Symmetry: D3
């Protein structure tokens, strides 16, 4: 499995590392694949680069 995770900027390296560990463990358990078959790509989005209902995260904040 190849997982792309888009999330807002602001997260510390610890939190990104905890997330890729935990999501890998979830995929390995639920789909019964090996850890090395799970790749995660993190795309961080600037607060002007993510919108809901036509307002960016910056505007909502």
């Amino acid at each position: 499995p190849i997982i792309q995770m888009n999330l807002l900027e602001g997260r510390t390296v610890e939190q990104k590392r905890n997330a890729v560990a935990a999501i890998t463990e979830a995929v390995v358990r639920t789909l019964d694949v090996r850890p090395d078959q799970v790749r995660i790509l993190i795309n961080e989005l600037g607060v002007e680069h993510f919108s809901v209902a036509g307002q960016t995260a910056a505007m909502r904040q």
Copy 2:
């Protein structure tokens, strides 16, 4: 709907904000969904990170 928009770097915050408003309004009208069901992710591409016919934007410029 979840919309990912890849566009070249260089645009001002106003222009990104105008684009996410206008695209949201288009999706809301044409598909009859609520504004909060429309999410837009902007991926900005560096001029060496986008190519047409094997030349990057930088080279074309």
Copy 3:
């Protein structure tokens, strides 16, 4: 600009065609690009293939 639009399955061709025209003109106007620089790719998602808060759109429809 290259736009990927992910939608749940089931929309009529007319609505997809109207969205593609409306999104294109939104991008042309707000980003000052020509129409031929605007490409949209539509990815339809089956109801078993989209989730919010850990429930798929299929299960959410089923529960209603």
Copy 4:
């Protein structure tokens, strides 16, 4: 967070549903977001549409 998961074809609905719940709760816990902020999109790949080292999963299965 918006998560796209690309999987080879053929998994049972139950496994997809368990993955979607497990991934969501992994993201909620580690990223301190609510469940309703977590969307997952699943893209299934046909065996002719995924390759490692220049051979498709179809050809790799065929060779075994």
Copy 5:
């Protein structure tokens, strides 16, 4: 490297297999990575699901 290739529908398996081999070797040579570090995912687009200048490939074929 992970490569997603979005193509219009309709290509023969042989052409997809030749593209996957040729793209992989292009990446190996120019990026100095091993073949097993190169994955390609192919996404086929229906003609109603791809547009240039606000017209879908279906409508563009229809008009010709």
Copy 6:
């Protein structure tokens, strides 16, 4: 064809340019499309933004 290439940060402009040329040539030959029908988008990933088996590239290094 529209190609998105995700690769780890660290590559020089020459190497990115050589890659988009070579991949374009491959697509043009194998699929018999024109060069201007091939667009490549490069997404560079930070070493904390790519994982295999639940470890980021940074951790593996």
